Every structure is written in C-alpha cells, then in structure tokens.
Design a protein around this ligand. Structure first.
Ligand SMILES: [Cl-]
Ligand SMILES: [Cl-]
Ligand SMILES: [Cl-]
Ligand SMILES: [Cl-]
Ligand SMILES: [Mg+2]
Ligand SMILES: [Mg+2]
Lengths: 232, 229
C-alpha cells in the first residue's frame, strides 16, 4: 500500500566495506549501489534517511536491538535471515559467474572451459560450484586464500578464468580491469532490504513502492549501471 | 565429556578482515586472536582444521548450508544467532573503552571529561554509550564516519579522546600507538565459536574442553596477550 512515514528520519545500518554495494570513494565519502539506490528510493517516496556504515555483523545486531530501523548491506536473502527479518521485494539478483581476460577470445560457452585453469577463493559458494562441476566441464580448480591473489593470477595469466560473486567482477570491470563475463551465470539468490521482523512495516512499503517507481522510471538501471558493467 | 573427531579435518569459516581477531600480516598470511586460539584449542584436543576467510556474511551462509563446519569470527552471541547456531562456552568478553593520548595527563576518569570532546564512529555501541552519558559528565560527542579519521583526530589533538572496541584500541597500543586507556571498560557482550544448530556436536565439545585446558595451562592468556599486551 501507499507508504506514509512515521519517523522524521529512518536510521539505516550497513557494511563499511563491501564494494560495489557500499564503500568509500577517494574523498572518503560513502557511495555504492545500496547507498544510491536506497537514497533514491527514500527521495522518491518522501522519506528521510540517516546511514550508519558500521559493518555487516554490527548492522544485523543494530537492527535486531532497535538501534537501527533498516539494513541495506548487500544482504543475501536466506530462510535463516527470514526467521528474524522482514524483507522488501528483492532489489538485485546474486549470481556466481565466470570472469575471463577481455583479451582472451577462446571462452564463449561453458563447453570451452575444457582444459582450462579456473580460480576460486577457498570455501566460497563459487569454489563449491566449481568443484561440483569440474568433471562435467573438464576444467581444473586452483584455490586462493584471498581475493587479491586470485585477481592477480587472472591478470598475470596463471589462471585462465575465475568464479566469484558477479557484482565483484562487474565492478572491477567498471573500475578499469580487462575482464569479461562471456558465459552463462549461475543464479544464487537475491539481495534484500531488511527490517526487524514485525517492525517498521511502512518502511518496507516505502521500499517496495519506491523501488517499483525507480524500475519504471529508469533510475534503477542508471544506478546499477554506474557501478556494474552493463550488458545493454 | 571426551571429544572425538569424526572427520580428518573440519572446515572453519571466518571474516577476511577483523583485526585483531582475524586478519592478514604483511606476509599475507592469516593470523589473529581467533586463528591462534582455535588452532591451539584444536591442537589440544587432537582435531585438525582448515580455515576459509570468506567474510562474516558468507561464513554464516556457508555454515548454515552445511559447507563449513564451524565459524570463529569475533561473533557476538545473541538470541537471534541462537536461533540457528549452537555455541561453545564464550571465549572472550568484548568491551568498549576510552582511548586518550598517552601524554595527556588531564583525563584519568569520566569526571575529567568535563568540557572535552570525544570521538565515536556513527551508529556504534560506543557512539550510543557516549551520547547516553554526555549530559552526566559534561562532554561533547564528535561523530566520525571512519576509523582512520577518528584516530588521526586523536593523534592531532582535534579531539581529546575517543571510544571504540577495546581490542582495537589495545592492539593499536601494542603496535606502538601513543594511546592510553585510563577508564574502566564497558561490557559489550561475549564472543562465541559456532556450529549450525544440531550439527557437529563433537566440535563444540572439543572447543569447550580445549578452551578450559588452555585457560588452566596458560596458553589462553599467552594468545590474548600476544595481540593486546
Ligand atoms: Cl562484519
Ligand atoms: Cl548473523
Ligand atoms: Cl508512490
Ligand atoms: Cl546473518
Ligand atoms: Mg567485511
Ligand atoms: Mg553468498
């Protein structure tokens, strides 16, 4: 239904370092998909916000304790989370996807992964997927303990490709990396805006109504495209 | 109760950057209180571990979907977490505390904060705590949006003190920062080792047994003191 504010300002908790969703620019101001998108949603609906960029764990606990009204933080919607949060309509799909070098034209479909070296960060959803499909597609998996070493290996040619959460890859491309995403991604759920279960229902109404308007009026795509290599 | 391992190795998920609990040293190896403490606990009990420093949110989701066995990640024990995780005995009491300059003799207690300005990061427990006691002791709160600027402000004298997580302040001091902690810390919960609720009970047993042995044998304090002094 139509959303009416019941607070002069709503407090939103978020991560302090989760690019491209929320991160600091060179001027030390917070920015990102979540920041621009929720700000644009509130503005569309005539709500006011105050952001607390405190970290994922801290943001969860702040909403649960009533010290924040909502959480916008690259948050994967899960059944475990639904036990204690209510979510707005999902605002972005999460995918696991393959990054190649943009200079390498040899990988055009999944069948071209035959004989390739694929990187993944140890213990991640990308790692689990790659391990589970290595025999089928015929690649070999090389594991990394952190993100920097993995992306360095793709750039120096010691892996042919890697799998990661798609926003990380598409943001690196937007930043200037010579990567591409030439093949089909693997759906892996959705991102959601959350309030404590049973709390601030009008803030969820705001969210859903504002989001629908931004999807229809083009601003939603403009915001995503600012941060993620768009296909268009 | 005796803990017996049922796997040759258990997988532990943790955050990639939460110093001094889990973080990378200059050699890009993962280290910290959580890493050293759970490794030592595991060793004490004859269990083997493999660590995946995937990030807090990702670690939660991995344990919940059965793709990591446990989580050791500066994890505050809360009722909401008890909905979906089982915990070992708490292994650390996380407090908030005040940092002043080590050369500033003027602040030794809360009442010495009269007329002073203290920093806190917006929307944190420290921010809430300072705001709640500002009228009582007659200080002003200056809000910061990131740690680096807040700590720089203390160092350059544009604030008189700050409040932050005690381990962050104590680790900074251990690293040579010229801060003091003149005021009694404020309790802010406890950290626990987690498994998915109903899973891996022998891993919780071994955590509890090992933690108790390390408290008794001196290693627990050695590990904490390594980082916090
Ligand atoms: Cl976090
Ligand atoms: Cl959580
Ligand atoms: Cl409307
Ligand atoms: Cl969570
Ligand atoms: Mg993080
Ligand atoms: Mg994930």
């Amino acid at each position: 239904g139509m959303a009416t504010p019941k607070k002069d300002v709503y407090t939103i908790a978020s991560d302090n370092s989760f690019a491209p969703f929320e991160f600091q620019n060179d001027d030390k101001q917070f920015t990102g998909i979540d920041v621009d998108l929720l700000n644009a949603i509130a503005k569309n609906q005539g709500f006011k916000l105050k952001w607390n960029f405190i970290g994922f764990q801290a943001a969860v606990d702040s909403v649960q304790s009533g010290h924040a009204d909502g959480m916008m933080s690259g948050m994967s919607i899960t059944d475990a989370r639904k036990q204690v949060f209510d979510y707005g309509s999902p605002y972005y799909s999460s995918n696991l996807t393959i990054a190649t070098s943009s200079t390498d034209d040899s990988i055009k479909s999944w069948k071209d992964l035959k004989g390739k070296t694929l990187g993944a960060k140890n213990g991640t959803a990308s790692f689990d997927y790659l391990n589970a499909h290595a025999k089928e597609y015929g690649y070999t998996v090389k594991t990394f303990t952190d993100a920097t070493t993995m992306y360095s290996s793709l750039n120096n040619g010691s892996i042919n490709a890697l799998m990661d959460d798609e926003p990380v890859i598409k943001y690196a491309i937007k930043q200037g990396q010579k990567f591409a995403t030439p093949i089909k991604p693997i759906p892996d759920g959705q991102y959601g805006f959350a309030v404590k279960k049973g709390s601030n229902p009008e803030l969820i109404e705001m969210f859903n109504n504002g989001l629908a308007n931004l999807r229809a009026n083009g601003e939603y795509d403009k915001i995503i495209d600012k941060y993620l290599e768009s296909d268009a």
